[PDB]
Design a protein around this nucleic acid. Structure first.
Lengths: 286, 44, 173, 95, 243
RNA sequence: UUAGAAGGAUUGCCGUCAGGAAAUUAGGUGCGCUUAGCAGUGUACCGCCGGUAGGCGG
């Protein structure tokens, strides 16, 4: 009857992320130019007088959702979960959730703060030694996701394939070119004065913040018409910028997966998107 | 984060360098006989 | 009054988008028009330390139609929401600036160039005492016009309910 | 006036609490209550008529480290300076 | 006739009469409920008109006047007379819970109890200090102490010939059981014998009766009446109980 | 209110004497681990009117 969730339950990530590096280059000559961005002692990083282009490089491992189980103490819960995933990967191709994640990689939300004064900002994404056409980032706004561009349809479909389980893996390598201006300041992540984070000597952003940026796709939260802005997808909808939970005890994943596997019910596809969006993270236990 | 609801901590996360793309795992095993593997038995 | 909305949950905090996105462009618009306008923080919240808010409101007594805010703020759309309606209302608090004295060094020069010869501790009492109370109020950075310095202004309620303006859009003596 | 304006005498302000706080931990059940009459009387110590803007009180000897809610114990710290001394008493006594 | 619970928190009795003949230590509970009738007698001397019906005792801290020897047996200490009759004394940090019913229960009658109790003694012992007098609404509104319940069922269902033998057997099974003094049994018929405290009251020679009681924790106790003491007067068997 | 009262207290050399010790096998087995936004804008400057009172311009 599947009366309760198991004592130990965990899902692995399916959007694994590099610690993003930084580089300083020039927009005019960018494909043949790269310079390290040292942190340059309250630590504070800034560009050189000549170089004017931040060159953030990050990689994304996409893994299937079925083979991301890591601990389950009831086989009945396991088969039901796999069946629920199958239910979805058949109805939808996981393209909607893919399109959302890839849109976040297409509109420069990974650049949390380092995108204010960017005149021209270019995002290049490569998979499997196949360089894709340029993603201009200022054209795509950061509230409404887009669904009718061919190349972003291409990469999104590939991500959907591995997500569904058709592919066992999919590595993504993105280089983003920010013309922040000559001798301007770049803002890397902080780690516990103002202690700046160093990756391989050069500065860079924590992988967590970057993954938080690629996770902001929640547009199906209950109180949306009111806020009308995408929030990052956690279990309780806790956007730290506002300060209040955005799903108390109604559409929470805890309650939602207690109404999907615990009690057989055909959920709306808006809420089924969220249950699988959560599945990308982990820690859903008792 | 939040879990089972009704200050940052340090964590270690090793990663491959930017140039490298391969993990090498080095180990060994000593295979030893089963017969001369009794360390304590109290009855001949 | 015209309400300019900080779009929330977009990344950065509201105060940096207040400091480098709306205030700088407003400063130019306010000074070039000879009729002065005003800046109001409807969501101003002095809990322990200031927190400007999530809204700014531009206020006056046709001159707001001559401000042309549709086209002067078209570069930060993915960040600032421009409400097209210009309604008038009375639920406003206007805002004054609180001086933060000056760095001991700055005052020392001033008070040595034309002042007394011997001057020690009492500046280290007076400046520090007034500043702490002043520095806890809400702060906006503004890039300079002709001095090249980073001025951290400090904003506070006035309740004057009607008055004149400065080039920054605040109350003045 | 009653307010820790000077930051030079600050290190004594941590050291006196740490000297009468070391090995003086007391669970909340046995700690003194934060009666509002004590901050009321400390406002009536010198004028004020309310807690002054941007200054706020601090038991020189941490309440947890056996402190009293008396007049001769409490002080006004700055907010950034209160953050410094509360990081000090967080680290030193290991709350 | 509203009923309310008034908590007298951390009352520090100094030199209460610990000696009660066969029982030394916990004083007779008749002292602790005659405190209630004295605190009601002087309140109806004023215009308060409160009738206290029950009182619960929470023994938070204790000290017996005397010294521990090498072996472990205490030796009690007594004041020097101005021939020392058998006597011993105890200090008790204990908290009262008063079931109070009458015209009205309010914070002003807590202030009246605050004024009135500072001229009173509990079991012949002066009051040094008090923490707070507050009306409580639930068991949570009571601080960590240990109430004295009457575990008469342990004495009744105890192996022995006589009930003393039963009490000796009872203290040899559970250790938290303490033998406590409760009431007075009549030894003669009532009448106007000469030499009384107040000539108009009828007078009866008595003998203290004793029982076995237990200590129950604050957040382990169930209900509030279960820890409230009351006066009951059968013919010739005056005593305070828990019912 | 086993109600109602109480000055225990003046005084002292605890010291001399010493063989604890002789023998051992700790130990054999193991999934830690799934996920995680650091900041109130870093927080400010430089001059002006004046007896170390108050303000002001950018």
């Amino acid at each position: 009857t599947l009366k309760s969730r198991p004592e130990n339950l965990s899902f692995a990530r399916c959007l694994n992320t590099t610690e993003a590096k930084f580089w300083q280059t020039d927009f005019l000559k960018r494909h043949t130019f790269k310079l390290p961005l040292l942190i340059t002692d309250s630590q504070s990083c800034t560009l050189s007088t000549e170089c004017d282009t931040l060159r953030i490089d990050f990689g994304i491992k996409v893994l299937p959702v079925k083979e991301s189980m890591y601990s389950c103490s009831d086989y009945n819960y396991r088969t039901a979960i796999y069946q629920k995933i199958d239910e979805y990967i058949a109805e939808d191709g996981f393209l909607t959730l893919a399109k959302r994640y890839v849109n976040n990689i297409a509109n420069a939300r990974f650049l949390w703060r380092n995108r204010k004064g960017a005149e021209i900002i270019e995002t290049i994404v490569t998979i499997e030694d196949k360089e894709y056409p340029s993603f201009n980032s200022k054209s795509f706004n950061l509230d409404t996701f887009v669904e009718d561009n061919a190349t972003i349809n291409e990469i999104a479909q590939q991500i959907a394939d591995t997500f569904a389980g058709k592919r066992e893996y999919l590595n993504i390598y993105v280089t983003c070119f920010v013309k922040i201006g000559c001798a301007m300041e770049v803002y890397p992540s902080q780690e516990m004065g103002k202690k700046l984070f160093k990756f391989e000597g050069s500065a860079g952003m924590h992988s967590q913040k970057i993954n938080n940026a690629l996770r902001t796709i929640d547009t199906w939260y209950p109180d949306y018409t009111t806020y009308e802005f995408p929030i990052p997808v956690e279990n309780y909808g806790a956007a730290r910028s506002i300060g209040i939970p955005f799903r108390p005890d109604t559409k929470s994943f805890y309650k939602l997966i207690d109404r999907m596997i615990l009690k057989n019910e055909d959920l709306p596809i808006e809420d089924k998107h969220y249950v699988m969006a959560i599945l990308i993270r982990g820690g859903m236990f008792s | 984060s939040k879990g089972h609801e009704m200050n940052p901590q340090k964590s270690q996360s090793c990663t491959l360098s930017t140039e490298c793309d391969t993990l090498r795992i080095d180990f060994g095993i000593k295979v030893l006989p089963v017969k001369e593997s009794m360390y304590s038995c109290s009855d001949y | 009054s015209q309400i300019l909305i900080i779009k929330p949950g977009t990344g950065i905090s509201p105060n940096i988008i207040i400091s480098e996105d709306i205030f700088p462009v407003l400063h130019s618009l306010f000074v070039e028009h000879d009729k002065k306008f005003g800046i109001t923080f409807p969501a101003y919240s002095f809990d322990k330390k200031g927190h400007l808010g999530n809204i700014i409101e531009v206020l006056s007594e046709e001159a707001l139609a001559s401000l042309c805010l549709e086209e002067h703020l078209a570069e930060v759309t993915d960040y600032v929401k421009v409400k097209k309606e210009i309604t008038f209302t009375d639920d406003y608090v206007l805002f004054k600036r609180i001086r933060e004295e000056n760095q001991y060094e700055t005052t020392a020069r001033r008070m040595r160039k034309r002042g007394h010869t011997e001057l020690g501790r009492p500046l280290e009492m007076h400046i520090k005492k007034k500043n702490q109370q002043i520095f806890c109020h809400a702060y906006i950075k503004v890039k300079s016009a002709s001095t090249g310095q980073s001025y951290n202004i400090f904003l506070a309620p006035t309740d004057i309910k009607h008055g004149s303006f400065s080039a920054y859009g605040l109350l003045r003596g | 006036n009653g307010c820790l304006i000077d930051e030079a005498l600050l290190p004594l302000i941590i050291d006196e609490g740490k000297r009468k706080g070391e090995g003086n931990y007391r669970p909340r059940h046995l700690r003194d209550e934060r009666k509002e009459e004590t901050v009321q009387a400390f406002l009536d110590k010198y004028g004020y008529c309310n807690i002054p803007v941007g200054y706020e009180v601090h038991h020189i000897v941490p309440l947890s480290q056996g402190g009293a809610d008396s007049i001769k114990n409490m002080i006004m710290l700055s907010i950034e300076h209160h953050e410094r001394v509360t990081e000090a008493h967080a680290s030193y006594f290991k709350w | 006739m509203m009923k309310g619970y008034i908590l007298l928190e951390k009352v520090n009795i100094e030199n209460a009469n610990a000696f009660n003949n066969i029982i030394v230590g916990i004083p007779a509970i008749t002292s602790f409920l005659g405190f209630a009738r004295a605190l009601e007698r002087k309140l109806n001397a004023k215009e308060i008109a409160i009738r206290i019906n029950g009182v619960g005792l929470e023994f938070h801290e204790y000290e017996l006047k005397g010294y521990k020897n090498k072996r472990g047996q205490y030796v009690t200490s007594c004041p020097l007379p101005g021939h020392i009759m058998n006597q011993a004394y105890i200090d008790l940090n204990m908290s009262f819970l008063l079931e109070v019913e009458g015209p009205h229960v309010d914070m002003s009658t807590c202030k009246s109890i605050k004024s009135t109790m500072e001229t009173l003694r509990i079991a012949g012992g002066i009051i040094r200090n008090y923490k707070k007098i507050r009306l409580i609404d639930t068991l949570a509104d009571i601080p960590y102490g240990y109430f004295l319940t009457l575990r008469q069922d342990n004495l009744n269902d105890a192996a022995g010939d006589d009930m003393l033998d039963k009490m000796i057997h009872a203290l040899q099974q559970e250790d938290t059981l303490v033998p406590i003094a409760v009431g007075f049994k009549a030894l003669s018929e009532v009448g106007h014998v000469e030499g009384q405290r107040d000539p108009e009251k009828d007078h009866c020679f008595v003998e203290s009766i004793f029982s076995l009681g237990g200590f129950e924790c604050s957040k382990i106790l169930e209900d509030i009446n279960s820890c409230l003491w009351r006066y009951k007067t059968e013919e010739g068997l005056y005593l305070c109980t828990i019912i």
